[PDB]
Amino acid sequence: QISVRGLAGVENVTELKKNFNRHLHFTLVKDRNVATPRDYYFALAHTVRDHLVGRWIRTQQHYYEKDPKRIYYLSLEFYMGRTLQNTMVNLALENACDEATYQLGLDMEELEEIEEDAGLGNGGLGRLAACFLDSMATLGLAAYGYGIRYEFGIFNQKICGGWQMEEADDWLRYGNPWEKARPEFTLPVHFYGRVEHTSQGAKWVDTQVVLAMPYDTPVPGYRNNVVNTMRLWSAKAPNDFNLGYIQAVLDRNLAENISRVLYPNDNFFEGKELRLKQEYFVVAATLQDIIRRFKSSTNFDAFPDKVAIQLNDTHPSLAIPELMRVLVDLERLDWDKAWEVTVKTCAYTNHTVLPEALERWPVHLLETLLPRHLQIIYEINQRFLNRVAAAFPGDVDRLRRMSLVEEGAVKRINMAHLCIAGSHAVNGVARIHSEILKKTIFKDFYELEPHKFQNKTNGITPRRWLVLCNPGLAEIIAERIGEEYISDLDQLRKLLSYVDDEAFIRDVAKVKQENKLKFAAYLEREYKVHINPNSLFDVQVKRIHEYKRQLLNCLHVITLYNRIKKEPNKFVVPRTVMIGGKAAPGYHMAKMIIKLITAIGDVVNHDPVVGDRLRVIFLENYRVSLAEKVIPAADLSEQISTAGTEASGTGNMKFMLNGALTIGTMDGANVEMAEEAGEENFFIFGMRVEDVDRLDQRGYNAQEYYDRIPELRQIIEQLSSGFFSPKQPDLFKDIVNMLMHHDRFKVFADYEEYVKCQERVSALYKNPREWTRMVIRNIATSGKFSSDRTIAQYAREIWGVEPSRQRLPA
Amino acid sequence: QISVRGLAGVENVTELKKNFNRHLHFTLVKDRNVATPRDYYFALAHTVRDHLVGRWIRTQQHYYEKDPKRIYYLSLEFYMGRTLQNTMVNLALENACDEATYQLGLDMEELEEIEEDAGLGNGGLGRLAACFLDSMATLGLAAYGYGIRYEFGIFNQKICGGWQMEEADDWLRYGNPWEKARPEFTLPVHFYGRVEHTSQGAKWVDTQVVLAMPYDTPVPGYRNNVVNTMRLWSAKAPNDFNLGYIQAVLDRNLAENISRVLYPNDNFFEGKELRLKQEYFVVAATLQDIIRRFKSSTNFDAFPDKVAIQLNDTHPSLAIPELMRVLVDLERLDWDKAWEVTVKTCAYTNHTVLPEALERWPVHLLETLLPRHLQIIYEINQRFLNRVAAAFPGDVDRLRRMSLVEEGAVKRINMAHLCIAGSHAVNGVARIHSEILKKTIFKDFYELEPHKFQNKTNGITPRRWLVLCNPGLAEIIAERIGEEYISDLDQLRKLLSYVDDEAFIRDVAKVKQENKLKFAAYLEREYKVHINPNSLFDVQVKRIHEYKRQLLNCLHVITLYNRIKKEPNKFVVPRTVMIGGKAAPGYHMAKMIIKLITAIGDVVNHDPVVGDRLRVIFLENYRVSLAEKVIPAADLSEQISTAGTEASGTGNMKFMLNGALTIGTMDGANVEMAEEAGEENFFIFGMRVEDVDRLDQRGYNAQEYYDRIPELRQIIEQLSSGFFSPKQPDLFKDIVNMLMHHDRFKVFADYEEYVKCQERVSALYKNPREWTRMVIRNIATSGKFSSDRTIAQYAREIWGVEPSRQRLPA
Numbered sequence A, B: 001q002i003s004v005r006g007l008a009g010v011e012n013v014t015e016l017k018k019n020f021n022r023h024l025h026f027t028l029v030k031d032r033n034v035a036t037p038r039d040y041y042f043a044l045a046h047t048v049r050d051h052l053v054g055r056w057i058r059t060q061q062h063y064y065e066k067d068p069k070r071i072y073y074l075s076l077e078f079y080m081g082r083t084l085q086n087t088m089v090n091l092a093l094e095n096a097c098d099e100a101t102y103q104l105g106l107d108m109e110e111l112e113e114i115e116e117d118a119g120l121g122n123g124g125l126g127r128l129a130a131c132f133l134d135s136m137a138t139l140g141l142a143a144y145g146y147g148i149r150y151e152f153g154i155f156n157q158k159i160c161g162g163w164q165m166e167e168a169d170d171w172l173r174y175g176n177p178w179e180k181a182r183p184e185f186t187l188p189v190h191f192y193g194r195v196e197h198t199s200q201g202a203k204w205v206d207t208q209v210v211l212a213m214p215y216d217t218p219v220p221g222y223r224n225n226v227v228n229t230m231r232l233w234s235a236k237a238p239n240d241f242n243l244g245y246i247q248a249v250l251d252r253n254l255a256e257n258i259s260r261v262l263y264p265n266d267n268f269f270e271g272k273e274l275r276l277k278q279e280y281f282v283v284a285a286t287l288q289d290i291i292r293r294f295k296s297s298t299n300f301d302a303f304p305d306k307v308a309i310q311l312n313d314t315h316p317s318l319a320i321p322e323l324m325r326v327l328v329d330l331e332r333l334d335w336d337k338a339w340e341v342t343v344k345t346c347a348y349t350n351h352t353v354l355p356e357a358l359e360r361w362p363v364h365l366l367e368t369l370l371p372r373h374l375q376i377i378y379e380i381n382q383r384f385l386n387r388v389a390a391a392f393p394g395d396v397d398r399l400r401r402m403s404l405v406e407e408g409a410v411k412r413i414n415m416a417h418l419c420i421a422g423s424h425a426v427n428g429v430a431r432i433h434s435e436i437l438k439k440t441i442f443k444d445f446y447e448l449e450p451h452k453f454q455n456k457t458n459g460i461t462p463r464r465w466l467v468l469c470n471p472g473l474a475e476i477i478a479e480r481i482g483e484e485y486i487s488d489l490d491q492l493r494k495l496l497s498y499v500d501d502e503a504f505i506r507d508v509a510k511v512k513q514e515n516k517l518k519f520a521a522y523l524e525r526e527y528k529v530h531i532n533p534n535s536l537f538d539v540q541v542k543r544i545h546e547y548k549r550q551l552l553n554c555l556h557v558i559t560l561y562n563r564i565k566k567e568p569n570k571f572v573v574p575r576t577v578m579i580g581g582k583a584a585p586g587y588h589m590a591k592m593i594i595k596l597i598t599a600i601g602d603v604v605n606h607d608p609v610v611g612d613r614l615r616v617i618f619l620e621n622y623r624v625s626l627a628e629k630v631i632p633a634a635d636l637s638e639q640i641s642t643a644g645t646e647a648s649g650t651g652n653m654k655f656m657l658n659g660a661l662t663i664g665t666m667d668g669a670n671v672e673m674a675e676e677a678g679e680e681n682f683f684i685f686g687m688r689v690e691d692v693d694r695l696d697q698r699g700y701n702a703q704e705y706y707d708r709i710p711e712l713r714q715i716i717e718q719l720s721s722g723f724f725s726p727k728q729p730d731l732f733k734d735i736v737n738m739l740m741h742h743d744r745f746k747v748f749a750d751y752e753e754y755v756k757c758q759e760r761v762s763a764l765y766k767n768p769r770e771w772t773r774m775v776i777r778n779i780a781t782s783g784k785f786s787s788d789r790t791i792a793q794y795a796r797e798i799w800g801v802e803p804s805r806q807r808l809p810a
């Protein structure tokens, strides 16, 4: 049907049909008379996978022969989502598969919906890793993603009586056709034990062994025949483990628990032993694999010329002392040479300045679990502080602030300090964030080693986040400017020539309308609720967190409700306010916010005076597959974090690419988005970072705003008095108490400006032609936010490799 | 090369090569430059599996269409061994695969050795189930094997310092290409809870749910295109299980432990809660599957016409009360109708009379775990004893003896009594055993219901146990009498015509010699030990147990050693004495026997005066794959259980088919083997059952034998004084103490006759022509011991179905 989906040639379609029937019979062991849609999904998945294999084998051979510098991206999270459609897009097979399935009497879109998300991340950090893998393959880099194969990914969210309930995400129940187990490359990982000092150095002995078994998943680049690998480790007990007999076998679970479950925290550090084991497990297995590959190309001087290790936050920070351990204890390099190699190999990306998110591990945990690593960390620290002392003689307080070891009731290791000391490059993830790092939390380090500090503004892959999820928009763009923009997103600037083109204005608005109808239908089918598709779709989807200020959105929703109740017969621009996201299971306030949102919906959605002018919907189980549905349908993107708290954001970019306008603070990448589009084409409001600092100096007093803003006082009185919870009048007292007395994120301080700015949104929505023209100006300037741009900068400025757009042979 | 391996046609070989290369590339994702022998094994396995699939699908369709009576064989154990070779044999693909692999530069015999045994049983009972499945498919019966997919099967045995050590049998580590997961047919199983009585009957409520996920394995018949199913259940937790968050996910292991590990006891009852859960799990999942299939053909009157359930010992005995539960509580049949259906559907096979092996479950365990089943058992008991009382009025002691409920310190349910009450047929597994059941432990039941009691003498499949493991023997037989004997083993009687044929005598002896050389080479390669292949191979392989009397064999070995030391320059017929088998991990005396055997070897094998005249080898890790190697190599089969203790034996039959002579007691199936071959062609010794009873009446006094037999006294003095354990002189005092004071199996009572009979063996071995003629008389009369004969009798006399040798279309 549509150009960007590729050709449906007669021979291709015939061959796909034949292989589909082959897999149904031989692989699935079904006949067509008892096959279900799930069987059909698997038959298609196996058919598409067969097209990856030849390219995968030959890509890996090519790297063996050419021996390029290899890039290892280490992350505890890879939020991959579904694989079927993405594979078809990247191999140009989508129209052919659609035609082949159609001729077999099947609807491919229905089959796509059967696939489970690979939910091996929490949100933005995990999803960034996934976009990065797609971009590294598209740019022809010899790149490997290394992580953990969690048996249970991010929990499935159910809403019961307006409250979040969690269910295990048993994503492997029906099998994963995309992975290949590689039990033959299983490696040992050591824990506990003790250090003994011989005449020939330190030896780590009496350890417990867990095996790391790798599973490989292919990562196809966009139409270049490159297929890279994501290698995820699974924990296995050795066969003599604990070897009465029956109990010993059952206790194998103790070792295998390492890879059982993803910790479900976003921007929060939970200092549990099992998490530390996960972090070491991934590092120890990965580094052995890296060294094996390097030796199969004595001379570790060339190691940083052949290897780059990128640390996705501090979660894999033990790579630094592990690399030292291997080089010093096992390869017998002198300390100084080993350190040189380590620093030149490793680079560190920071993704947050929130203090509760920074990893600070108690020394007693490391002492017990990883006694040799603790010794190495202490030695790193002493040598590092000797440099600080020579550079800043007599500055004793600087020595305390920069130490890797934090003193206190409990001594802790600051892993961020370790990463800076042991990396040749340190970057933040948007310009304002990278500046904040240099001015505040890493100021001392910046003064010592200014050359280490860089910025790499985040991005998103336009394959998944435009072509895959919004084919209608991709097509109308391609009609005007061709297909080259899909791997060169800067070409979208050519669309500025069509801002006054009546046909293009019409087509952009038509695509949005179609996406809105499709989404409104999805809601009725799967969740039995009726929404008005002519209303403005006002969307805030992201993890639930105080810093992201879902609560500020709630205050605006109640303000609109109260204004309608005050003047029921006045016209207002109709809205559907959609809020979705998961709360971490132990984060009480985040769970209370979800309950508030559903409670507001219970009042607003059933008030007959409101009608269809205002609807408040909580979108259940927000995840990558749901993002692909709701983002193309959105008119207004809510990006309303307190200035200085959202390091970048990436949902913001997804909305910009898909034809929503943004209401937001000057935070994270929002700043750069407004710069690219023009401030006149963005709905900017609220305190800047400098304003937040000024308020902190004076002291934030929320009572002042309550006393001065009658509309705000009314809302707080409604919350306190039980207007939104009649059977339990005190249900929201924790929320009220937080807002009035201990709000770290200054919700009330941005309320007035936010409401006023929302009024400007509504005014522009009344003029569809001007709304759509502003949309075009946003889509047209979204090019900078391609993860292809981001990865090219990492490649050239950190890893020392040149990207390529050249095709390998097919 | 050899006829019975089938044709290697040009098109067949070309097609196998092409599909092998396809699986190596697409299924395994390897190129030939880095493929290992393991990859080649998998590529061949997938290639052979593809030939099963069409036949499997069409066999199951055929049963759906024709709706024959279905046979459900319920077992906690299926000791399957390797699948690759057996599949090739049954599909007539062996020569073609050999040729295809040869042309690819690969040795198929080497690839066969890579496959793991499916070790989901302990010994004879589990292996009988496996032979039975092969025979049911070969006879065209609509049969299903139902069991548990243990993650860990029978442990791998290592010998360290002469002692058994156990290691987990991680048989699934590299994947199992033969099974197909069927997550779509997952069913719930309930545990714990309580019973409430409504006006509409009893309801079992507040239960914990575990899911049963089936995995299906194909079971091919011999060249008839029938492929039946073995369905094994695996335990999974529901996704809301225990649903802080992290611990709840980790605690899913509690539910999943049900299918984790095979209890490693042979002929011993261990009354643990986890075992009871296993037994109910398999029954509850299986019965739902049976009922589903029956309803997809209100009228349960036809249930016994469409369903037969065979209980493999009492291990699945909960099928009886579970079927009643379903019919009464869920389908709402009246009790009497439900009981009629149950009795006509179920049949019970007993495999042991040893009191320590009989399952007697404490009432308190059933009360907690399965409260509704305990109520049903009590009701069964009361109604059953009412019948007994009406038949034998006033016989109060009979009421006590026959009760399903045993009184005592702890009340227990006798599961064997339950099985008899609830089954229309009860059988033993050899004629003497079935007679013992009627005269001793089940005498009261036999008097009440004589018609229930039957015999079904055991057998072995001649596919695995002749054609597969001894192709050389199969071929020389086929040269004379054709190939029909492989599915009609009674045709081996035609070989009696060749007992005086010089060429046949030569060929039989040549095949044995070849098998002996091959086995002696296997020993040197894999276990660094040198044996004389001209010696008599004297073999006792079976689980280590006091009743099997490995100790009696040890006494003979020491007797031979002592006689050599007394008269070193006298000729004796050289022997290699091989003993192998696993001890249950908690069975101390069995572990001490293993140590004694290796200790005897340490002395005998290093005495220069002995030379190569006597060698004592402990065969490590005896399992199905090792049986297939050692049995064809054996000259003498040791079958020396105390009369009345081995219910049948099946190793005995394997040796008879493969050209070994038997030394044995008149126990189990040995009696029938001697009857078929003629007592003159069997080395029979020792007490008969009647002699054992006479000694028990008088009182067994082992001291009498010690006092009267100087050769025996010498051995006991050697054991006691530390001759076989110089560093630990008292190491064997438990063995000596048992033999002298509490030997339940009367080792000393059969010693003199055993030694004398062994002298007759040695005398016959000196005359190779007469030895070989006796061998021919044994092979020629082994036909009765085909499991095809056994299954035809079950079919006609218990299940009410007619076997068929007709081919389904290919």
Ligand SMILES: Nc1ccc(-c2nnc([C@@H]3O[C@H](CO)[C@@H](O)[C@H](O)[C@H]3O)[nH]2)cc1
Pocket (backbone or CB within 6 Å): A122, A124, A125, A128, A265, A266, A267, A268, A269, A351, A352, A357, A429, A458, A646, A647, A648, A649, A650, A668
């Ligand atoms: N456990 C744990 C789990 C996750 C995190 C964490 N830290 N930063 C992030 C997100 O990374 C994204 C990608 O750079 C940013 O766009 C976003 O602003 C930021 O909040 N996630 C921290 C701890």
Ligand SMILES: Nc1ccc(-c2nnc([C@@H]3O[C@H](CO)[C@@H](O)[C@H](O)[C@H]3O)[nH]2)cc1
Pocket (backbone or CB within 6 Å): B122, B124, B125, B128, B265, B266, B267, B268, B269, B351, B352, B357, B429, B458, B646, B647, B648, B649, B650, B668
């Ligand atoms: N846990 C457990 C596990 C196993 C058993 C058990 N009972 N009998 C047997 C063997 O069955 C074989 C097949 O019928 C007989 O040939 C053999 O003589 C007999 O000893 N195994 C009992 C308990």
Ligand SMILES: O=c1[nH]cnc2c1ncn2[C@@H]1O[C@@H](COP(=O)(O)O)[C@@H](O)[C@H]1O
Pocket (backbone or CB within 6 Å): A057, A060, A061, A064, A293, B031, B033, B034
């Ligand atoms: O010794 C070799 N000969 C040929 N190819 C090799 C050899 N070692 C590695 N390779 C190639 O590189 C491998 C990629 O996996 P790796 O071993 O994880 O790097 C294989 O897929 C081979 O194609």
Ligand SMILES: O=c1[nH]cnc2c1ncn2[C@@H]1O[C@@H](COP(=O)(O)O)[C@@H](O)[C@H]1O
Pocket (backbone or CB within 6 Å): A031, A033, A034, B057, B060, B061, B064, B293
């Ligand atoms: O409704 C039906 N139509 C056609 N074939 C069926 C149907 N139900 C079961 N079958 C056949 O029997 C099945 C065997 O699996 P079962 O459901 O476990 O008995 C399938 O393999 C089908 O070939």
Ligand SMILES: *Cc1c(COP(=O)(O)O)cnc(C)c1O
Pocket (backbone or CB within 6 Å): A122, A123, A124, A127, A541, A542, A543, A622, A623, A624, A627, A648, A649, A650, A651, A652, A654
């Ligand atoms: C992009 C994305 C995120 C990150 O959104 P932010 O608004 O930047 O926090 C989180 N979750 C999912 C499922 C995503 O696709």
Ligand SMILES: *Cc1c(COP(=O)(O)O)cnc(C)c1O
Pocket (backbone or CB within 6 Å): B122, B123, B124, B127, B541, B542, B543, B622, B623, B624, B627, B648, B649, B650, B651, B652, B654
């Ligand atoms: C046949 C067999 C058995 C049973 O042997 P018995 O001598 O009858 O006890 C036990 N284990 C294995 C591996 C077998 O093949």
